[PDB]
Amino acid sequence: GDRVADVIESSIGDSVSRALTHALPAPTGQNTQVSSHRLDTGKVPALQAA
Amino acid sequence: SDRVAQLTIGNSTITTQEAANIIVGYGEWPSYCSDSDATAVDKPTRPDVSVNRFYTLDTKLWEKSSKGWYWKFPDVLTETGVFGQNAQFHYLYRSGFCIHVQCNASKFHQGALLVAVLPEYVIGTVAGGTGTEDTHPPYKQTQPGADGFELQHPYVLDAGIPISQLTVCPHQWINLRTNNCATIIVPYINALPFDSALNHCNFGLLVVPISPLDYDQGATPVIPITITLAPMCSEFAGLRQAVTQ
C-alpha cells in the first residue's frame, strides 16, 4: 500500500502521452472567405515571431 | 414592335427603326462569375457604368468588291476609355458583350451582310502558297485592334474552314431590303473563369458580304458599316501596374 503523500500524488507511471494536436478531416483545399478593409490598433496578423 | 428598338446601357443609348430582333448567344445572358467557378481569391472590381457602356470604335466602307472584315474581342477595346485602363491594370478580366453593327442604305440599294461571332477564332496563313512553308500570322493580324482586318480568303475564313457553315455560330444578317442593323449579345466564353484581356481573344466578330452591294449610278455610293459594342458584367482582378501587352 501507499501512505506518504508524495507517492500518492506522483505522476510516475502515467502511460497516456498527452497530445497537443489532433487530426481533422480535410478532403479539399480550404475555402476563402470574403474580407474587407480593417484599420485597427492592437490587431496585427501580419507581424510574427519566427 | 420587333422592327423598332432601344438599347440603353451606361450613359449611352442606341435606336433603330429597322431591326430584326436580338440574338442571345447560345441562349444565355452574360453573368458575373459565381463563387464556385471562381478560383482567384482577391476581391474583384466591378466598375459598372464606367465600362459597361456603348463604344463606337470603327467605320468601314462597304464597296461592290469588299471581301469582308473581322475584329477580335476584347482586343478592340483594350486601349479605349475606362474599360481599357482596367484591362491594362489587371491581370484578370471577364465580361460579356452587346454588339450592334450598323449599316443603312435606301430602298433601291441591295446586298446582304452576314454578322457572326466565332469563339477562339484562330487565324491561319496560306503556308507560302505551296503549303510547304510553315509560316505564322503576325501580331497585327491576330490582334488587329480597333481598325480590324480585311479577310484575304473569305470562303475559308482565313483558317481552312467553310464560311458557309458560319451560321452555326450566333449571327444575324443585314439584308438592306429588310433591316439596317444586327444586334448580338454574347456571354463570356472560355474554359477558365477569368483570363488575360491582352493575351487571349475570346471570340472574333465577322462581318462578311455574302450578297454583293449593288445600286444604280446616281444613288449614294458611300455605304458605311459602323461597329458599336458594349461590355456587360465586366469584372477585373489581379491588380498591378498598367501593361499594354
Reported resolution, Å: 2.8
On whether the CB atoms of residues B75 and B143 are closer than 8 A, the answer is: yes
Over the Cα atoms of chain B, what is R_g?
A: 19
Find cell 507517492 and name the residue: A7
- The span from the CA of B146 to the CA of A18, in Å, is 70
Kindly identify which residue of chain B lies nearest to residue A32, measuring between CA atoms. Answer: B41
Instruction: Please state the domain count of chain B.
Output: 1
- The span from the CA of B97 to the CA of B187, in Å, is 7
> With 0-12 CB in 10 A as exposed, 13-18 as middle and 19+ as buried, what is B138?
exposed
Over the Cα atoms of chain A, what is R_g?
A: 23
- The span from the CA of B96 to the CA of B31, in Å, is 8
Return the closest-CA partner of residue B229 out of B208, B210, B204. Answer: B204
- The span from the CA of B71 to the CA of B78, in Å, is 12
Amino acid identity, residue B141?
Answer: Q
The H-or-E segment that residue A5 falls in is helix A5-8
Return the closest-CA partner of residue B57 out of B46, B71, B38. Answer: B71
Q: What is residue B68's DSSP assignment?
A: -
Q: Is the peptide bond before B74 cis (omega within 30 degrees of 0)?
A: yes
- The span from the CA of B233 to the CA of B186, in Å, is 11
Find cell 476609355 and name the residue: B81
Shortest Cα–Cα distance, B104 to chain A (Å): 50
Structural domain boundaries, residue B37: 1-245
Way the structure was solved: X-ray
The H-or-E segment that residue B57 falls in is strand B55-62
The enclosing domain of B85 has a CATH number of 2.60.120.20
How is B154-222 classified by DSSP, letter by letter?
A: GGGTTTTS-GGGGGGSSEEEEETTT-SEEEEEE----SSSSB-TTT---EEEEEEEEEEEE--BTB---
Q: Does A32 contact B41 at a Cβ distance shorter than 8 Å? A: yes
**Phi/psi of residue A30, each to 5°?**
-60, 150
- The span from the CA of B227 to the CA of B181, in Å, is 10
Burial A12-45 (b: 16+ CB within 10 A, else e): eeeeeeeeeeeeeeeeeeeeeeeeeeeeeeeeee
What is the distance of C-alpha B149 from the center of its chain?
12
Which of B36, B41, B42, B45 should we substitute to test contact with A (largest number of A Cβ atoms within 10 Å)? B41
Compute the Cα dihedral for B43, B48, B50, B53 and give only its sign.
Answer: positive
Return the closest-CA partner of residue B187 out of B66, B30, B16. Answer: B30
Kindly identify which residue of chain A lies nearest to residue B41, measuring between CA atoms. Answer: A32
On whether the CB atoms of residues B181 and B113 are closer than 8 A, the answer is: no
